[PDB]
Amino acid sequence: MQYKLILNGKTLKGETTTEAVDAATAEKVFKQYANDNGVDGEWTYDDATKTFTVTE
Numbered sequence: 001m002q003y004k005l006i007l008n009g010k011t012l013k014g015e016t017t018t019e020a021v022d023a024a025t026a027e028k029v030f031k032q033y034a035n036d037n038g039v040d041g042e043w044t045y046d047d048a049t050k051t052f053t054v055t056e
Helices: 023-036
Strands: 002-008 013-019 042-046 051-055
Touching: 002 023, 013 023, 023 051
Parallel strands: 002 051
Antiparallel strands: 002 013, 042 051
């Protein structure tokens, strides 16, 4: 039901999770919350485990 985001920065690291009834909302919150933080790099999306990650 909920997905977990994995942060793999060069000088910054962390992990956060959010619970949503829909993937569109959960993914939006992650991309929105991450983007607002000024995160730059590459983003991965695994429909297999419904988990996203961002590497810098």
